[PDB]
Each structure stands twice: as C-alpha cells, then as structure tokens.
Design a protein around this ligand. Structure first.
Ligand code: ZN
Length: 221
C-alpha cells in the first residue's frame, strides 16, 4: 500500500523517550540526543533501539495537509511518537518533495536544519550525495557473513531510503559507500542509518543486537 493511502504509524510511545523532548530544529536537540546516546552501555557507538521501517511506517501526516515541505527527524530515526499528528512529513523524500524544497531553500537540509556544508570544516576533496558507512562488522555483531550477503544488507537498508545511484561494499576497509541520486535522500538516510544494527530478525544474533556497535554513517570525502 502506497504511503499516500494510509496515515503515518506511531513509532514509539512518548514515555519511551527521555524527558525534555526537543524540537528537531531546536537549540538543545544535540545536547538531548548526545545524552540519550551516552545513557546506553558501553564504549563503542550505541546500537539504537529504534528504527525506521519505511514500508510499515510511512504515511500521511497533518504536515502533508498543512503545506509542510520538511521531513520528520524523529521519524527518520524510528522514534516519532506523533504518527498522523506530526506536523512534519513521514515518508521517504521523492522527486516532487525535492523540487518543492529547492524552491524553498538552499541552506537547509530536508529536516529544516542548516546544511552540513555551510558550517563544517571542509577537509578538502557541490552537492555531496555520497555516504561513507563504517563499522560494518560491529553492526553485525561480528557475524560470519560473506561479501555478497553483507552487500545485500547495506543495499536493502539504504535503497529503501531513496533512489540509489551506486553502492559499494569494500571488504578490506570494513566499509561501504552509498551514493544517492538526490542529496535529500542522502541527508535523510544519514540520520536514519546512524547507530543502526545490520542484523535481521532471522539472524540467530537478533535478540542480542544491542550488544553490537551501531553503524557509523558520515558524508563521504
Ligand atoms: Zn514525526
């Protein structure tokens, strides 16, 4: 069923989230989120207990009916408690959405925040659409998988987040590179896949997925 033909699913209960829930573009979002992350055990990047399931979760929100052009950051991370009440969009950014955003802004990402490029230090190397995906082995709890299997999992989880230009898994570096057709999908996928497991419900290790190390997802250089 098309996301257009349903209302967005509530992903978590508000009571599951830490208090002082911030606006996604708000002053304290990173303080709050970093605190959330640091609250987990132990030393490597936490494995988020929440995840976006695009087919299951995507749907209409009040945002769709209220002229909203920007996407819900909590939704991308699998942790929006609002569902159809949300005033931000709950679907995977598409060509239409992106066209409207282009008329609306040059300086904001798909979540309405300042684009990375406008404040980050350019280490050196025009619309970056490529993500570096690191710590693949750790996101699988060191499960013994082969490159064909590993590549299929990276492809599966990222391709459901937007049209893919190219994906590469690089065994020797324990990493992957995912290039989206559109910058908006890269922006969205980066937030969606950060700290995610790459285990699947069918894996023997699934119940112990928290004991891995969440994926590292950065802009590729
Ligand atoms: Zn939302």
């Amino acid at each position: 069923t098309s996301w257009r033909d349903k209302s967005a699913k509530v992903q978590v209960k508000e009571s599951e989230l830490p208090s002082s829930i911030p606006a996604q573009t708000g002053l304290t979002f990173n303080i709050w989120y970093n605190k959330w992350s640091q609250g987990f055990a132990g030393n490597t990047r936490f494995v988020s207990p929440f995840a976006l399931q695009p087919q299951l979760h995507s749907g209409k929100t009040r945002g769709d009916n209220d002229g909203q052009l920007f996407f819900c950051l909590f939704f991308a991370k699998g942790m929006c408690c609002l569902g159809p009440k949300c005033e931000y969009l709950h679907h995977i950014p598409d060509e239409e959405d992106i066209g409207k955003l282009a008329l609306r802004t040059e300086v904001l990402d798909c979540f309405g925040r300042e684009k990375f490029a406008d404040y980050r230090e350019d280490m050196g190397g025009k619309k970056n659409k490529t993500l570096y995906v690191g710590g693949i082995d750790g996101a699988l709890n060191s499960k013994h998988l082969k490159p064909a299997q590993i590549e299929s999992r990276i492809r599966f989880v990222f391709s459901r987040l937007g049209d893919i230009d190219r994906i590469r898994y690089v065994e020797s570096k324990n990493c992957g590179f995912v290039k989206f057709k559109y910058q908006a999908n890269a922006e969205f996928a980066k937030e969606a896949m950060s700290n995610q497991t790459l285990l699947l419900p069918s894996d023997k290790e699934w119940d112990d997925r928290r004991e891995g190390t969440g994926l590292l997802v950065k802009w590729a250089n």
